[PDB]
C-alpha cells in the first residue's frame, strides 16, 4: 500500500523539518528549499511517498508540476506567524482546487504549537478557511516539528483515510 | 517523458551519496558562512572566472558529448572525473530557454537544477580517466524511476521568475520577462 504524499506550504512553515523527522526520527537543520526534497517513509504498513517543495513566493508557480498522481496533501502551517496566515490560506485553496489535487485527502499540519504566541488549530482551521469545506477530506493536526509532537497522530489520520 | 540529462564533476559517487545528491555550491556556503543561496539563473549562468560560490544551482549537459566536453574544459587538469546520467525533475531549467537572446553562454546549451539533484534522481555514472571513457555504465541502486519517470523539467515560463537579471537590465522591459519584473525594472 503506498500512498504519495504531497507536502506544500510558505517558507519557514517546517516541512522539511517535519519530512526528516519522520524519515530519521530526529529534527535536523535545514536550508530553504529551492527544489525539492523526497523520501520514502513507512508507517503502520503504508509507504508514505512524500515530496517536499520549497514554499518561496517565486518557486510556489512549480508546485503543479508535482500534483499528478497526489494522493495526499500535507499543507504545514506555522502557527505563530500571523503575518501570513492569510497568504497560506489563499495558497491552501489554490492547491486543492486544481484538477489534479481533487481526490486528494488534506492533512494539515497546524505546526510550531510549541511557540507561546501560535494560533491553536481551531483558530488555523478558520484563518485558513476550511471551516466549511464538507466536501473534502481534511483535518487540522496540532504538530511541533521539532518535537515530533502530532506527526503520528496526522500519519494517523493519513492512513485511516487510505 | 524519461529522457535523462549529464553532468561532468570531479566528486566521487561515494561523497555523492553521502552528500544526498549533486548538491548546489550554496548549501554548503549556507551551513558555513549562513549565506543565503543565489536563485537568480542569470548570476548562474554568468559565474565568474568557476561557479560562485552562493550559487543554487546545479548545471546539467542534455547531451554524453556534451557533458564529456564539460569534462574536457571545465574539469581539465582534473585526472579523473565522473559523468553523472540524471533523471528530469520539475526543478530543472533549460537556461538558453530562460534568459533567451541575453543567455551569457548559449553554447552550454545548460540545463540547470534548481536546489540541487537527490541522490535517488541520479540514474548512474560513467568514470573518466585520462581523458578516456572507456567504461560503461555503473548503475545507482539508489536511484528511484517511480520518483521522476512522469516528471519533466520546469518549463521555461515557470523559470522566467527566477531569471535574475539584474534590476536595470533591459530584459525586464521586453516580453517575457517584463510580466515577472521586480518593481522598477
Ligand atoms: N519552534 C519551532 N520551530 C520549527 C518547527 N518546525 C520547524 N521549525 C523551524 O522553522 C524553520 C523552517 O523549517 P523548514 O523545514 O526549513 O521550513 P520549510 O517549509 O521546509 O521552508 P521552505 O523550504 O522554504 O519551504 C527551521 O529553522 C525549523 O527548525 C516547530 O514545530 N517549532
Ligand atoms: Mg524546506
Ligand atoms: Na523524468
Redesign the interface.
Known amino acids: 500500500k503506498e500512498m504519495r504524499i504531497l507536502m506544500l506550504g510558505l517558507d519557514a512553515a517546517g516541512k522539511t523539518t517535519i519530512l526528516y523527522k519522520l524519515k530519521l526520527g530526529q529534527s535536523v537543520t535545514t536550508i530553504p528549499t529551492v527544489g525539492f526534497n523526497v523520501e520514502t517513509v513507512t508507517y503502520k504498513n503504508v509507504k508514505f511517498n512524500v515530496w517536499d517543495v520549497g514554499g518561496l513566493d517565486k518557486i510556489r508557480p512549480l508546485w503543479r508540476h508535482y500534483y499528478t498522481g497526489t494522493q495526499g496533501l500535507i499543507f504545514v502551517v506555522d502557527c505563530a506567524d500571523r503575518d501570513r496566515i492569510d497568504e497560506a490560506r489563499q495558497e491552501l485553496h489554490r492547491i486543492i482546487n486544481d484538477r489534479e489535487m481533487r481526490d486528494a485527502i488534506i492533512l494539515i499540519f497546524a505546526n510550531k504549537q510549541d511557540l507561546p504566541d501560535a494560533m491553536k488549530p481551531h483558530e488555523i482551521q478558520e484563518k485558513l478557511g476550511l471551516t466549511r469545506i464538507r466536501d473534502r477530506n481534511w483535518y487540522v493536526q496540532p504538530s511541533c516539528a521539532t518535537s515530533g509532537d502530532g506527526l503520528y497522530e496526522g500519519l494517523t489520520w493519513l492512513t485511516s483515510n487510505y | 517523458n524519461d529522457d535523462k540529462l549529464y553532468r561532468a564533476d570531479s566528486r566521487p559517487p561515494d561523497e555523492i551519496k553521502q552528500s544526498g545528491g549533486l548538491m548546489p555550491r550554496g548549501?554548503s556556503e549556507?551551513?558555513d558562512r549562513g549565506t543565503?543561496?543565489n536563485?537568480n539563473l542569470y548570476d548562474h549562468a554568468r559565474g565568474t572566472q568557476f561557479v560562485r560560490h552562493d550559487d543554487?544551482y546545479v548545471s546539467t549537459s542534455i547531451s554524453l558529448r556534451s557533458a564529456h566536453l564539460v569534462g574536457q574544459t571545465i574539469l581539465s587538469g582534473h585526472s579523473t572525473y565522473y559523468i553523472y546520467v540524471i533523471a528530469t525533475?520539475?526543478?530543472m531549467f533549460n537556461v538558453n530557454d530562460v534568459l533567451g537572446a541575453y543567455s551569457p553562454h548559449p553554447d552550454d546549451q545548460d540545463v540547470s537544477?534548481?536546489?540541487?539533484?537527490?541522490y535517488?534522481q541520479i540514474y548512474g555514472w560513467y568514470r573518466v580517466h585520462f581523458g578516456v571513457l572507456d567504461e560503461q555504465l555503473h548503475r545507482n541502486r539508489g536511484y528511484?524511476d517511480?520518483?521522476y519517470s512522469?516528471?519533466?523539467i520546469?518549463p521555461a515560463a515557470?523559470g522566467y521568475?527566477?531569471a535574475g537579471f539584474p534590476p536595470e537590465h533591459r530584459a525586464w522591459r521586453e516580453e517575457p520577462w517584463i510580466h515577472h519584473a521586480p518593481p522598477g525594472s
Open positions: 548549501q549556507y551551513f543565503q543561496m536563485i543554487g525533475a520539475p526543478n537544477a534548481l536546489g540541487g539533484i537527490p535517488s528511484r517511480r520518483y512522469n516528471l519533466d520546469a515557470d521568475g527566477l
